[PDB]
Design a binder for this molecule. Structure first.
Ligand SMILES: N#Cc1ccc(-c2ccc(-n3cc(C[C@H](NC(=O)C4(c5ccccc5)CC4)C(=O)N[C@H]4C[C@@H](O)C4)nn3)cc2)cc1
Ligand SMILES: N#Cc1ccc(-c2ccc(-n3cc(C[C@H](NC(=O)C4(c5ccccc5)CC4)C(=O)N[C@H]4C[C@@H](O)C4)nn3)cc2)cc1
Lengths: 145, 145
């Protein structure tokens, strides 16, 4: 019902779930803007990233589809409680923020690349995005404030 | 005569000076390609910028002429030693690289807009640009590596 949400059916299980077309998040439960938000992220870069390099690898060669598989694995592990978002960011994020558990600090509109901004402002506090595609790569976003 | 450097005559002084038509650097003293360079910048946006918005201001309304006056003013404070480049970038850059004292990190050709890229690769390590004009606004570039 709320802006951007779709009620859908898994094509494998028939299970009802909810998908947000601004954050790309999905959740089983039916769902129910701030001047500034604070977000942490986990970035997985790919060969078409604007800067296909990070602390992890001088030259990033994984495809966009490989980056998306990695992101989807992190999301599964976070949603299941098997892993912490911020600990996965610290270990695997292709970002200089990985060291700060993926914290990018507070921002208003006008600072972040538009897809990351749109997802960040549409999250609830404590909520995680789905895969968010930017010029930089693929992100998961955790709104912290 | 390193790349883009040329000799000129000061009308008012009578003395030879040096100007770089790629970096817009100018200096009395005679001066003197890697895969990657590391540069810091100070960006001043204007109402005609590709994205008239930054972490400093939702709506950037200053004119291109006013943006250039601010840039010339900052270059003056830097060269006089009244302000470090880092202190002015931290306070007044319209790029959120202000958080990292203007540091954009290491990049290769292909990532940055051509006038910024060309200036960045034409600077030697430690050197600073004059006003560099992009679609994003007006930059002072400092090559750090
Ligand atoms: N220790 C430590 C430490 C070190 C570094 C950080 C860190 C903190 C903040 C950032 N960051 C980067 C950005 C800007 C940005 N970038 C982005 O818009 C996005 C992004 C892409 C890639 C990496 C990080 C952010 C969101 C999409 C970017 O590409 N912006 C463009 C200019 C145009 O108008 C959109 N803002 N903040 C980057 C790094 C934090 C902690
Ligand atoms: N803490 C922290 C922190 C916060 C932010 C950053 C930060 C890091 C990197 C960037 N950045 C922006 C860009 C895009 C680039 N952009 C550009 O080419 C230019 C640019 C404009 C505006 C801002 C920054 C760069 C040089 C002209 C651009 O516009 N490129 C175009 C695509 C076409 O092929 C040329 N790449 N990296 C922006 C911000 C780093 C650290």
């Amino acid at each position: 019902l709320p802006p951007g949400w779709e009620k859908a059916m898994s094509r494998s299980s028939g299970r009802v779930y909810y998908f947000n077309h601004i954050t790309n998040a999905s959740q089983w439960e039916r769902p129910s803007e701030p001047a500034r938000v604070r977000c942490s992220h986990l970035l997985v870069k790919h060969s078409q990233s604007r800067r296909p390099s990070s602390w992890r690898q001088e030259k990033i060669t994984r495809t966009k589809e490989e980056a998306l598989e990695l992101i989807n694995g992190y999301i599964q592990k976070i949603k299941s409680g098997e892993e912490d978002f911020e600990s996965l960011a610290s270990q695997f994020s292709d970002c200089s923020s990985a060291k700060a558990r993926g914290d990018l600090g507070a921002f208003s509109r006008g600072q972040m690349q538009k897809p990351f901004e749109d997802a960040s402002f549409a999250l609830r506090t404590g909520e995680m995005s789905g895969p968010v595609f930017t010029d930089s790569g693929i992100h998961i976003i955790l709104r912290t404030e």
